[PDB]
């Protein structure tokens, strides 16, 4: 809804829960748990591993999503004047139309590139597999990380 911000709900593996882990293999369960923990609770990792995971995520999901959203928003700006005539100009109306269109197209493109590339990044990335083997998180770690992520989202909403 309008009251709260929900851009984090369906991005960065926030939707992973125990149902994703019950049916997964041991290695796949480890990969999913590590991905959720690294995206949501980076404090559980060493700083070097945090930097490596951020670099691997940015060039694949985060910054790519930002760029795709920017391009899709630029698609909605073929003509910036939009409604405009010699007799009257509509600067405020055109600004409002841009603020209504470009954020929408940005959201659509960002959600698309997350819906396409995130599963492949989780399942077909060497850095994620190597760091998952390095850390080897358990189900208890995933439960604690889920609690911490929800509490951090609540705190961000509070502030």
């Amino acid at each position: 809804f309008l009251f709260y911000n929900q851009q984090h709900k369906t991005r960065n593996g926030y939707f992973i829960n125990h149902d994703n882990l019950m049916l997964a293999s041991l290695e796949e369960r480890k990969k999913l748990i590590f991905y959720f923990i690294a995206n949501q609770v980076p404090e559980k990792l060493d700083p070097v591993d945090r930097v490596k995971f951020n670099e691997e995520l940015s060039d694949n999901l985060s910054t790519k999503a930002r760029l795709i959203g920017s391009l899709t928003g630029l698609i909605g700006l073929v003509g910036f004047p939009y409604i405009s005539t010699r007799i009257y100009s509509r600067p405020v109306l055109n600004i409002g139309l841009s603020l209504l269109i470009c954020p929408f197209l940005y959201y659509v493109g960002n959600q698309l590139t997350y819906s396409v590339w995130e599963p492949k990044f989780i399942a077909n990335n060497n850095t994620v597999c190597e760091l998952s083997k390095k850390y080897n998180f358990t189900v208890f770690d995933f439960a604690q990380a889920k609690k911490e992520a929800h509490l951090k989202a609540l705190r961000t909403e509070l502030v």
């Binding site: 009251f3 829960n17 439960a143 889920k146 609690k147 929800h150 609540l154 909403e157 509070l158």
Partner: protein
């Protein structure tokens, strides 16, 4: 009730959810008053 099940779906227990559930209800109600106050002004 519904929020209790939703928050228990996330890793939580029935006792802990009630403390967390109350805060969200209080926060949402405060926003509703702020929206109601904004409507009266404009």
């Amino acid at each position: 009730g519904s929020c209790l099940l939703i928050f228990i779906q996330l890793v939580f227990s029935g006792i802990v959810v009630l403390l967390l559930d109350d805060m969200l209800n209080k926060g949402y109600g405060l926003g509703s008053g702020i929206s109601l106050f904004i409507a009266t002004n404009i």
